[PDB]
C-alpha cells in the first residue's frame, strides 16, 4: 500500500511537506517516515520532502542508456526510408 | 565649435539631453538667426526633440528588446511623453516598435515571419561552403612556395 | 571580443562582462554600445534577457593560442560528418539505382 | 439538419409563396430560427437581420417578435436582453410549432452556446462576475450551464474558482490546422485498407 | 573522367539549401494542379463500363490520360521533398 | 421626386449622388413661392450638410455655410448642430463630438435620415480614432485608451469586443488584467487549404474505383 | 604570387555535341532521378570532410 502511493505521488507534487506525506503513507512516527523517503532518494530539508530529486534522477538515467536513437527515430534516417521504398 | 555639433548629431552615439544641452547652452545663444532670437527660443526647444529623435534610430538598431522604464530616463522624460514620441516614428516608418503600457517591455523590432528565418538560415549554410573550399586552395599554395 | 571568440558560444551575459571588465553592469551598456558603433562587433543587445548576442567578430592578427582553439573546433566538426555518413552508407546500401 | 431549411425558408420570403400552407408571418418566424442556428455571426446580419421581407412584414405577431428580438440583441452585444428573450422564444415559437417541438430544448441550449463562444473569441480572459452579470445569471448559475457545454465540445475554455477568471483555450493557429487535417487523411487510409482487402481476398 | 567530373563545385551543389518561399511555392503549385486534373480522373473512372478501347480514349479520355499525368507530378514533388528534408537534416547535424 | 431619390441613395451610401439630388430639391423650394415650402427647404439644407460630412470633406461643407441662405433666409439650430459635428469629425476628437450631441439632441433626432447616419458616424469616429491608438502598441491597457477617447472604461470595452467580431485587427481582450492584445498573424495557410481539397477529392475517387469493380463478386 | 580563381567549365555549344555523344556512361554526377541524388548526398558529405 505504501509503495503504490509512492509511485502515484511522484507526478502529483514538486515538493510537499513532512507533515502532509506522513498522513498519506500512514506512518505514526517520524523514524518510519524519514526512512522511506531516503530509499526513494527524496531529500528531507526543514521538514519538506522533494519529488524533484527522484523525478530529475530518473530522467538522466534514461538518457544515459541506449534504446533511444531508433525508438525516437532519427530524422535523417526517416528520409532514407522514404527514398528507398520508391526505388525498390 | 561647429565640428563638434554636426559630428555629435551624425554618428551613432547614446547620449542624454543635459550633457548635450550643457555643451551648447552659452555657445549658440550669442548667434541670432539661429537660436538667439525670441521665436528661436522654440528652435532651442526644437533641439531637445531632435537629439531624442536621433536616439530612437540608434536605440532601435542596436537594442532589440529593452525595458520601457530604462528608455524613459534615456530621452529624459515621463512614460506618457515617451510613448507618444515612439509612436510618431512608428507611423512615419522611421522605426517599428511595440510599446506596452504596463512597462513590461518595449520591443524595438520589425517582426520576422516563419519564411524570413528559413531564408536567412539557407544563406548562412550556402556561404559557409564557399569559405571551406577557398581555404583548401590556399593551403596548397602557401606550403608549395614555403 | 577576445573572450567571446575563443568560446564556442557567440553571446555573453551582462554578468559575465561585469566581472570581466571589473566595472558595473551599468557600464556594460555603454561600452558594448560603442563596440557596435565602431564596428568592432555587430549584433543585438538585450537588457530584458540581459544578453548581448554578437553576430560578428572583427579580424585580428592571430597569435598561437587562438590557432589552437580554431583546431579543436574542427576536430569536433569532422567527427560528426563521419558518424552521420556511416549510418547513411549502411541504410539503403543495396538500393542506389 | 436545418441547413437545407435556412436556404428554402428565405426563398420563401423573397419570392411571395406561403400558400396552401401556413401564413407568411409563420414563414418568416421559421426563417429566423433556422437563420440563427446554421449561420455564423458574419453571415447572420447579412441574411436575417437584413432582409427586405422580414423588415417589411415587421413583428405584428408575438411568435415573430421573440425570435427577431434575440437576433438583434446578439449583434448589438446586449446579453442581458438575450437571456430573457430566449425564454420568450421557447414559449411562443418553438413549443407552439410542430417541427421545433422536439428541437425546442436543442435551440435553447445551442443559443446559450453561440453567445458564450462568440464572447470567448473576443476575449482571452474574463471573470466569472463580469460574464455572469452581463448574461443575467450569477456565478454559480454560470458554472453549471458552462459545465455541460464545455463537454459538448463548442466553447473550449476553462473555469478557475480559485482565481475566478475564465481563460480561453481555443487555438486558431498551427495546432487547429493539424488536428483537422490529420483526421481526414486517416479517413483516406481507412478506405484504402478496406477497399484493397476484399479484392485481393477473392 | 575529364568530361564527367565538374570540379570541387560539383559536390557543393548537393549540400546547398534554397529560399523557402520557392520551396513552399513549389509544393502548392503541384498540389493545386492535382485537384484540377483529378476532377478529370473522376469522370474517367465513373464510366469505363463500355467496350472498345479506342472509344474509351475519345469519350472519357485516355489520350493525355488523367491518372497517368497526376501520377508523374505527384511522384516528382514527393521525391523533391524527401530530398529537401534529407539535405536539410544533413546540414543541421553536420555543420553544427 | 428629387428628395425621395436622395434619401435612398443616402442609405445606398453614395453621398456624392445623395448631394446632387438634395441640391436640386433645394432649388425647387427656394425659388418656388412660399406657402409651406419654407419648412421643406430647411430639412433639405440639413440633408446636404449630412451627406458631405460623411465624405469627410470640410472644403465643401464651408461652401454650403454662407450668408445668403444658410445664415440669412434660413438660419436654424440644426444647421449649427451640423457644422459642430463636421469640424468635430475632422479634428478626430470624439471629445468634441460628445459636447455637441448633448445640447443638439433635439435637432438630431427630429430628422430620421440624420439620425441613421449620425448614429453611424459615432461608430466610425470611435473607430478611426481607436485603430490609430493601438496600431504601434501591444499589451496596451483598455483603460489607458479610454482616457484619450473620453468614454467610461466599460463602455469603451464593449465596443472593442465588437471590432474583434468584425475582424479588422482581430485580437483578444483581457478583462481581468485589463489588456488588449493584437494579432495580425495568419490563421490558415495555403498549405493547409489545398491539403484539405486534395484528400477530400481522393475520398470520392476511392468510392468510385469500387463502384466500377462491382462485377468482381 | 598566384591567386586562384574559379576554374569553371560551362562549355561551348560546339563542344557539347561531341561530349554527350562519346558519353555512354551514367555520369559521375548528373542530378536527374532520386537515385542519382541519394548517391549525391552521401558523396557531398565525404566531400565536406576531405577539404
Amino acid at each position: 500500500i505504501r509503495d503504490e502511493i509512492a509511485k502515484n505521488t511522484e507526478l502529483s507534487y514538486d515538493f510537499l511537506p513532512l507533515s502532509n506525506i506522513k498522513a498519506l503513507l500512514f506512518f505514526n512516527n517520524e523514524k518510519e517516515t524519514e526512512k522511506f523517503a531516503l530509499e526513494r532518494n527524496w531529500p528531507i530539508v526543514n521538514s519538506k520532502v522533494y519529488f524533484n530529486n527522484q523525478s530529475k534522477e530518473k530522467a538522466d538515467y534514461e538518457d544515459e542508456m541506449m534504446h533511444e536513437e531508433d525508438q525516437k527515430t532519427n530524422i535523417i534516417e526517416k528520409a532514407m526510408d522514404y527514398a528507398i521504398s520508391i526505388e525498390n | 565649435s561647429q565640428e563638434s555639433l554636426v559630428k555629435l548629431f551624425t554618428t551613432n552615439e547614446l547620449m542624454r539631453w543635459p550633457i548635450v544641452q550643457k555643451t551648447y547652452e552659452p555657445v549658440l545663444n550669442e548667434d541670432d538667426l539661429a537660436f538667439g532670437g525670441e521665436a528661436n527660443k522654440h528652435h532651442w526647444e526644437d533641439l531637445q526633440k531632435r537629439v531624442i529623435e536621433h536616439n530612437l534610430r540608434v536605440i532601435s538598431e542596436y537594442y532589440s528588446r529593452i525595458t520601457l522604464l530604462r528608455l524613459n530616463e534615456l530621452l529624459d522624460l515621463t512614460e506618457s511623453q515617451t510613448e507618444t514620441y515612439i509612436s510618431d516614428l512608428v507611423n512615419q516608418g522611421i522605426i517599428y516598435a511595440k510599446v506596452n503600457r504596463p512597462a513590461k517591455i518595449v520591443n524595438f523590432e520589425k517582426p520576422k515571419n516563419s519564411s524570413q528565418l528559413l531564408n536567412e538560415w539557407s544563406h548562412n549554410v550556402d556561404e559557409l561552403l564557399e569559405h571551406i573550399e577557398t581555404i583548401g586552395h590556399l593551403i596548397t599554395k602557401e606550403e608549395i612556395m614555403h | 571580443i577576445e573572450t567571446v571568440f575563443v568560446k564556442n558560444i557567440r553571446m555573453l551575459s551582462f554578468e559575465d562582462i561585469s566581472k570581466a571588465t571589473h566595472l558595473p553592469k551599468d557600464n556594460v551598456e555603454h561600452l558594448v554600445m560603442r563596440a557596435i558603433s565602431l564596428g568592432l562587433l555587430k549584433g543585438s543587445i538585450d537588457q530584458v534577457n540581459e544578453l548581448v548576442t554578437i553576430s560578428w567578430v572583427q579580424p585580428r592578427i592571430i597569435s598561437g593560442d587562438q590557432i589552437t582553439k580554431m583546431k579543436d573546433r574542427l576536430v569536433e566538426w569532422n567527427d560528426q560528418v563521419e558518424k552521420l555518413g556511416k549510418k547513411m552508407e549502411a541504410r539503403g546500401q543495396s538500393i542506389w539505382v | 439538419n436545418f441547413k437545407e431549411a435556412a436556404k428554402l425558408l428565405v426563398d420563401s420570403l423573397a419570392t411571395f409563396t406561403s400558400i396552401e400552407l401556413t401564413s407568411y408571418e409563420s414563414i418568416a418566424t421559421y426563417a429566423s430560427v433556422t437563420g440563427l442556428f446554421t449561420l455564423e455571426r458574419t453571415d447572420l446580419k447579412s441574411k436575417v437581420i437584413d432582409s427586405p421581407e422580414l423588415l417589411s412584414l415587421i413583428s405584428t405577431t408575438a411568435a415573430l417578435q421573440s425570435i427577431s428580438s434575440l437576433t438583434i440583441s446578439l449583434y448589438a452585444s446586449d446579453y442581458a436582453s438575450y437571456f430573457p428573450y430566449l425564454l420568450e422564444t421557447y414559449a411562443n415559437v418553438l413549443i407552439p410549432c410542430k417541427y421545433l417541438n422536439r428541437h425546442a430544448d436543442f435551440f435553447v441550449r445551442e443559443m446559450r452556446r453561440k453567445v458564450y463562444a462568440q464572447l470567448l473569441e473576443s476575449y482571452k480572459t474574463l471573470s466569472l462576475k463580469s460574464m455572469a452579470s452581463a448574461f443575467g445569471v450569477s456565478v454559480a448559475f454560470l458554472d453549471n450551464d458552462l459545465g455541460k457545454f464545455i463537454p459538448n465540445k463548442q466553447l473550449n475554455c476553462v473555469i478557475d474558482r480559485v482565481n475566478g477568471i475564465v481563460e480561453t483555450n481555443r487555438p486558431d493557429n498551427k495546432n487547429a490546422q493539424y488536428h483537422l487535417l490529420v483526421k481526414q487523411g486517416d479517413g483516406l487510409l481507412t478506405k484504402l485498407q478496406k477497399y484493397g482487402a476484399a479484392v485481393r481476398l477473392t | 573522367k575529364m568530361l564527367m567530373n565538374l570540379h570541387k563545385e560539383q559536390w557543393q551543389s548537393g549540400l546547398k539549401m534554397y529560399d523557402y518561399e520557392e520551396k513552399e511555392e513549389s509544393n502548392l503549385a503541384a498540389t493545386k494542379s492535382m485537384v484540377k486534373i483529378a476532377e478529370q480522373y473522376s469522370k474517367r473512372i465513373e464510366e469505363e463500363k463500355e467496350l472498345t478501347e479506342e472509344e474509351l480514349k475519345t469519350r472519357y479520355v485516355g489520350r493525355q490520360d488523367p491518372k497517368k499525368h497526376l501520377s508523374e507530378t505527384a511522384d516528382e514533388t514527393l521525391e523533391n521533398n524527401i530530398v529537401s528534408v534529407l539535405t536539410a537534416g544533413v546540414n543541421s547535424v553536420a555543420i553544427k | 421626386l428629387d428628395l425621395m431619390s436622395g434619401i435612398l441613395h443616402c442609405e445606398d451610401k453614395d453621398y456624392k449622388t445623395a448631394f446632387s439630388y438634395f441640391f436640386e430639391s433645394f432649388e425647387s423650394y427656394h425659388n418656388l413661392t412660399t406657402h409651406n415650402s419654407y419648412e421643406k427647404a430647411c430639412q433639405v439644407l440639413k440633408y446636404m450638410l449630412l451627406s458631405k460630412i460623411m465624405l469627410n470633406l470640410i472644403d465643401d461643407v464651408k461652401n454650403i455655410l454662407n450668408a445668403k441662405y444658410t445664415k440669412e433666409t434660413y438660419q436654424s439650430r440644426g444647421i449649427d448642430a451640423m457644422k459642430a459635428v463636421a469640424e468635430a469629425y475632422n479634428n478626430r476628437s470624439l471629445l468634441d463630438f460628445n459636447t455637441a450631441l448633448k445640447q443638439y439632441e433635439k435637432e438630431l433626432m427630429g430628422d430620421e435620415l440624420t439620425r441613421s447616419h449620425f448614429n453611424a458616424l459615432y461608430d466610425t469616429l470611435l473607430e478611426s480614432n481607436l485603430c490609430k491608438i493601438i496600431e504601434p502598441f501591444e499589451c496596451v491597457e483598455i483603460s489607458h485608451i479610454s482616457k484619450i477617447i473620453g468614454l467610461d472604461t466599460q463602455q469603451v470595452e464593449g465596443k472593442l469586443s465588437q471590432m474583434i467580431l468584425d475582424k479588422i485587427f482581430y485580437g483578444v481582450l483581457d478583462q481581468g488584467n485589463g489588456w488588449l492584445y493584437v494579432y495580425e498573424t495568419p490563421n490558415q495557410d495555403a498549405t493547409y487549404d489545398s491539403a484539405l481539397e486534395l484528400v477530400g477529392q481522393l475520398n470520392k475517387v476511392v468510392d468510385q474505383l469500387f463502384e466500377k469493380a462491382s462485377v468482381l463478386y | 604570387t598566384f591567386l586562384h580563381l574559379p576554374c569553371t567549365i560551362e562549355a561551348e555549344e560546339a563542344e557539347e555535341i561531341g561530349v554527350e555523344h562519346l558519353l555512354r556512361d551514367v555520369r559521375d554526377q548528373a542530378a536527374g532521378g532520386l537515385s542519382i541524388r541519394l548517391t549525391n548526398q552521401l558523396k557531398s558529405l565525404k566531400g565536406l570532410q576531405s577539404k
Side-chain angles (χ1 to χ4, degrees):
Chain A
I1 291 171
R2 297 180 158 113
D3 203 71
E4 280 182 90
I5 298 169
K7 310 193 301 192
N8 305 331
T9 59
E10 286 165 283
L11 288 176
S12 314
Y13 296 108
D14 304 302
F15 39 85
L16 180 69
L18 189 57
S19 310
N20 285 338
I21 189 169
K22 182 177 172 179
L24 294 170
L25 291 174
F26 304 113
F27 297 132
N28 293 299
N29 290 108
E30 310 198 276
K31 302 80 201 169
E32 301 177 303
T33 326
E34 63 88 7
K35 159 172 186 71
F36 201 71
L38 292 161
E39 294 166 86
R40 277 283 179 152
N41 318 120
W42 285 323
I44 314 208
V45 176
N46 56 287
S47 292
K48 186 180 266 177
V49 189
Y50 300 93
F51 292 99
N52 291 155
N53 199 102
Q54 180 167 67
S55 194
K56 189 71 196 74
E57 185 189 308
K58 177 76 170 183
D60 302 305
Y61 276 10
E62 297 319 299
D63 315 311
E64 199 167 45
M65 306 166 194
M66 174 46 179
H67 304 279
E68 312 183 311
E69 299 183 38
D70 48 85
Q71 194 166 85
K72 295 167 184 304
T73 304
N74 295 6
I75 62 178
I76 311 101
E77 300 182 6
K78 283 182 192 67
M80 188 50 65
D81 304 319
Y82 292 161
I84 67 160
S85 55
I86 302 170
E87 283 167 56
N88 194 262
Chain B
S1 286
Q2 300 300 311
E3 182 70 89
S4 51
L5 184 53
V6 67
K7 184 191 185 302
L8 190 58
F9 206 69
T10 302
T11 53
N12 310 279
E13 296 185 13
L14 189 49
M15 66 287 197
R16 303 174 60 199
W17 184 242
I19 306 175
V20 185
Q21 173 188 236
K22 187 168 70 68
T23 303
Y24 297 106
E25 198 167 283
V27 204
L28 308 178
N29 193 54
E30 299 284 288
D31 292 294
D32 295 293
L33 209 63
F35 294 95
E38 184 79 273
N40 285 280
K41 291 295 191 69
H42 311 279
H43 286 34
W44 176 238
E45 191 169 275
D46 188 57
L47 199 71
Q48 191 171 135
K49 299 197 174 278
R50 297 295 91 105
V51 169
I52 59 183
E53 179 211 50
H54 157 269
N55 292 110
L56 287 163
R57 300 188 281 127
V58 177
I59 273 175
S60 68
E61 301 188 326
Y62 310 159
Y63 295 81
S64 194
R65 203 182 294 172
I66 176 171
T67 36
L68 170 57
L69 306 176
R70 187 60 178 160
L71 177 69
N72 311 135
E73 305 303 296
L74 290 174
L75 316 176
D76 314 76
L77 313 160
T78 76
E79 184 176 292
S80 298
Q81 287 182 78
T82 277
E83 195 165 51
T84 308
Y85 299 146
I86 278 158
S87 310
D88 281 40
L89 283 68
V90 157
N91 310 151
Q92 286 174 129
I94 312 303
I95 45 167
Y96 283 114
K98 293 286 196 179
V99 199
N100 299 41
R101 188 69 188 170
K104 287 180 186 296
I105 58 185
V106 52
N107 194 355
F108 286 84
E109 228 181 20
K110 209 180 163 48
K112 297 186 79 63
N113 293 99
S114 291
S115 52
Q116 292 187 282
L117 294 163
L118 294 151
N119 280 7
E120 184 189 352
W121 191 85
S122 302
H123 306 159
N124 295 348
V125 146
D126 300 309
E127 280 179 326
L128 184 136
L129 291 164
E130 307 189 64
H131 305 142
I132 292 295
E133 298 192 341
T134 61
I135 281 168
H137 292 126
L138 302 171
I139 294 160
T140 307
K141 179 188 67 52
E142 178 66 62
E143 289 176 307
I144 285 290
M145 292 171 64
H146 183 239
Chain C
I1 175 174
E2 194 175 290
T3 293
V4 65
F5 191 48
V6 293
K7 307 163 66 175
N8 194 62
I9 67 180
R10 312 288 149 181
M11 66 287 289
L12 293 173
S13 286
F14 286 172
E15 307 197 296
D16 286 343
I17 296 175
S18 304
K19 291 183 307 190
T21 60
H22 302 75
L23 296 172
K25 188 175 172 281
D26 289 289
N27 283 199
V28 189
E29 311 178 4
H30 287 302
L31 309 168
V32 72
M33 193 281 307
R34 298 279 173 192
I36 326 290
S37 307
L38 301 167
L40 179 60
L41 293 171
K42 295 182 197 302
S44 46
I45 320 168
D46 309 317
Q47 303 199 6
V48 176
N49 301 314
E50 314 182 343
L51 308 174
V52 20
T53 290
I54 54 155
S55 43
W56 197 61
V57 282
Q58 163 186 84
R60 285 157 72 210
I61 190 171
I62 309 309
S63 296
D65 196 40
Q66 298 191 258
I67 316 187
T68 305
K69 301 288 190 299
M70 276 159 91
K71 198 168 118 292
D72 310 296
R73 281 184 283 274
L74 309 179
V75 168
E76 181 181 0
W77 188 344
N78 190 282
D79 275 4
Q80 286 179 300
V81 174
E82 177 55 54
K83 294 207 98 207
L84 190 56
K86 290 184 296 171
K87 298 177 179 186
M88 293 166 61
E89 187 174 88
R91 293 167 77 92
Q93 186 66 279
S94 312
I95 308 177
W96 307 122
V97 186
Chain D
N1 292 301
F2 298 113
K3 291 189 159 172
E4 194 60 67
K7 298 296 103 64
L8 298 169
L9 283 164
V10 80
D11 283 350
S12 294
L13 267 180
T15 302
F16 205 112
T17 328
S18 301
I19 53 70
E20 293 284 316
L21 281 172
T22 187
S23 211
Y24 180 39
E25 317 196 310
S26 298
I27 291 314
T29 306
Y30 312 143
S32 318
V33 176
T34 60
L36 198 70
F37 199 83
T38 56
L39 296 170
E40 293 182 288
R41 188 266 172 189
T42 55
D43 310 288
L44 188 72
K45 190 51 168 68
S46 305
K47 296 186 188 60
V48 184
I49 304 170
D50 302 306
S51 190
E53 308 289 304
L54 188 66
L55 279 149
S56 67
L57 185 54
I58 60 185
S59 292
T60 329
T61 52
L64 194 42
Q65 190 74 87
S66 294
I67 182 63
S68 283
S69 299
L70 195 61
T71 322
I72 287 163
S73 54
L74 187 136
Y75 205 103
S77 311
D78 195 88
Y79 300 136
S81 62
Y82 190 82
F83 179 46
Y85 281 162
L86 184 59
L87 305 164
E88 289 168 43
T89 318
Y90 185 82
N92 294 126
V93 169
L94 319 172
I95 290 291
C97 186
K98 289 201 288 284
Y99 305 110
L100 283 178
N101 188 255
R102 302 181 60 174
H103 294 124
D105 287 310
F106 202 46
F107 193 82
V108 165
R109 291 196 291 190
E110 211 293 288
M111 275 38 255
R112 288 290 291 180
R113 273 171 291 175
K114 196 175 175 169
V115 67
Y116 275 139
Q118 188 179 195
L119 196 53
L120 282 164
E121 292 180 306
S122 300
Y123 282 78
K124 180 60 192 55
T125 297
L126 272 144
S127 312
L128 284 164
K129 179 79 147 86
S130 77
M131 190 170 187
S133 54
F135 277 119
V137 263
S138 59
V139 176
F141 292 162
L142 194 61
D143 292 325
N144 298 315
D145 297 78
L146 298 170
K148 294 176 296 210
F149 297 149
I150 297 165
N152 297 123
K153 307 278 178 300
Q154 188 43 245
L155 313 182
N156 316 114
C157 52
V158 298
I159 295 143
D160 287 355
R161 307 182 151 260
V162 177
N163 275 256
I165 50 183
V166 282
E167 300 181 64
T168 307
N169 303 45
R170 190 184 318 256
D172 43 271
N173 57 70
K174 300 302 278 296
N175 304 88
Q177 296 176 44
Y178 171 93
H179 307 315
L180 208 65
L181 184 62
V182 294
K183 299 173 190 191
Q184 202 167 90
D186 294 339
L188 188 68
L189 195 74
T190 311
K191 280 172 200 171
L192 295 165
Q193 281 173 120
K194 281 262 51 179
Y195 289 154
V199 170
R200 306 188 179 116
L201 187 70
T202 313
Chain E
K1 185 167 177 181
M2 294 167 154
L3 303 178
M4 302 185 300
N5 291 163
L6 294 170
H7 313 296
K8 293 185 163 308
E9 296 184 82
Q10 195 177 50
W11 49 261
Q12 187 182 70
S13 21
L15 284 166
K16 310 195 74 189
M17 290 303 294
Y18 296 99
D19 290 80
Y20 271 83
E21 300 196 309
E22 213 83 288
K23 298 177 196 281
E24 290 165 29
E25 171 167 291
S26 201
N27 301 325
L28 181 298
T31 299
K32 204 76 157 199
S33 289
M34 294 170 60
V35 182
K36 306 311 182 173
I37 303 306
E39 278 156 86
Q40 207 172 27
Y41 186 31
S42 294
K43 302 171 53 274
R44 175 162 169 281
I45 45 67
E46 173 170 299
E47 290 280 290
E48 203 170 303
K49 306 176 161 184
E50 281 76 16
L51 198 54
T52 334
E53 302 304 274
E54 182 56 25
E55 284 176 31
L56 299 161
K57 307 203 166 53
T58 311
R59 299 171 304 183
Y60 316 110
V61 188
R63 291 184 318 270
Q64 300 296 289
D65 193 271
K67 180 184 77 191
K68 179 182 167 57
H69 278 93
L70 297 156
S71 192
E72 295 162 276
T73 329
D75 183 47
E76 180 166 293
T77 298
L78 164 76
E79 290 174 326
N80 187 77
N81 286 341
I82 296 167
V83 171
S84 308
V85 183
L86 189 61
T87 311
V90 163
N91 300 113
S92 304
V93 173
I95 295 166
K96 175 68 172 161
Chain F
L1 183 55
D2 301 321
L3 185 56
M4 285 266 43
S5 292
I7 292 171
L8 299 190
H9 307 146
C10 201
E11 295 167 80
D12 282 345
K13 309 305 198 176
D14 290 65
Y15 283 124
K16 283 283 208 175
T17 315
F19 183 61
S20 65
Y21 278 98
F22 287 152
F23 197 99
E24 252 60 66
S25 303
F26 195 67
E27 299 296 80
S28 298
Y29 296 130
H30 204 171
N31 299 131
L32 289 173
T33 186
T34 295
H35 63 292
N36 202 76
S37 292
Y38 72 108
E39 309 179 343
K40 327 298 295 301
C42 292
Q43 288 171 240
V44 165
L45 192 56
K46 306 198 195 66
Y47 291 152
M48 279 156 46
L49 287 166
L50 170 52
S51 48
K52 197 69 58 66
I53 301 171
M54 300 300 288
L55 287 185
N56 193 242
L57 300 169
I58 51 157
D59 319 292
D60 306 331
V61 158
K62 291 202 181 294
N63 298 338
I64 301 157
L65 293 166
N66 41 25
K68 288 177 291 302
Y69 56 99
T70 308
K71 285 185 189 176
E72 175 168 294
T73 300
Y74 307 90
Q75 167 68 91
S76 289
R77 192 83 171 190
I79 310 279
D80 287 281
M82 292 304 90
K83 69 195 189 192
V85 175
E87 299 267 287
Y89 200 35
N90 185 76
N91 305 327
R92 290 291 171 190
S93 290
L94 179 70
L95 285 161
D96 306 355
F97 195 54
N98 292 354
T99 300
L101 53 92
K102 296 200 284 295
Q103 52 199 350
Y104 297 147
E105 196 55 61
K106 297 179 184 285
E107 311 309 318
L108 180 45
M109 290 300 299
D111 278 289
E112 303 176 52
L113 193 61
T114 316
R115 183 217 58 220
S116 299
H117 296 118
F118 283 6
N119 282 359
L121 193 144
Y122 179 51
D123 301 307
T124 298
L125 175 49
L126 189 146
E127 175 168 359
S128 303
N129 297 2
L130 177 56
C131 294
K132 191 173 194 59
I133 292 169
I134 73 157
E135 177 185 67
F137 295 156
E138 157 61 51
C139 198
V140 55
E141 294 168 53
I142 301 171
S143 50
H144 178 70
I145 298 159
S146 297
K147 291 176 205 310
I148 314 288
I149 292 287
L151 296 169
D152 200 36
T153 297
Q154 300 302 114
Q155 185 58 41
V156 177
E157 188 175 286
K159 301 300 196 73
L160 314 176
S161 299
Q162 177 179 347
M163 310 271 167
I164 301 162
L165 292 172
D166 300 305
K167 284 188 181 65
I168 56 167
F169 43 75
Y170 45 86
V172 290
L173 282 175
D174 298 58
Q175 193 285 304
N177 307 313
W179 297 333
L180 174 80
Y181 295 171
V182 293
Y183 290 89
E184 307 297 76
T185 62
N187 296 329
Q188 73 293 315
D189 297 282
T191 50
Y192 161 52
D193 292 310
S194 293
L196 282 168
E197 297 182 63
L198 189 54
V199 173
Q201 199 79 31
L202 293 170
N203 293 296
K204 304 167 171 65
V205 180
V206 291
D207 311 320
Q208 295 173 100
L209 283 174
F210 199 99
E211 181 224 315
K212 184 202 294 189
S214 59
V215 197
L216 305 186
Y217 313 108
Chain G
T1 201
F2 285 117
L3 196 59
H4 200 253
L5 308 171
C7 63
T8 199
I9 298 168
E10 290 179 332
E12 316 164 51
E13 311 185 325
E15 293 296 315
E16 289 177 62
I17 310 287
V19 159
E20 288 297 300
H21 173 67
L22 273 280
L23 176 79
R24 59 138 281 187
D25 313 286
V26 315
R27 227 168 184 222
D28 185 299
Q29 280 302 313
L34 190 59
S35 43
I36 305 176
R37 297 180 281 194
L38 192 85
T39 313
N40 195 348
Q41 192 62 34
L42 181 50
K43 174 179 168 58
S44 321
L45 264 160
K46 300 302 125 159
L48 182 73
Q49 197 185 244
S50 69
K51 293 298 284 178

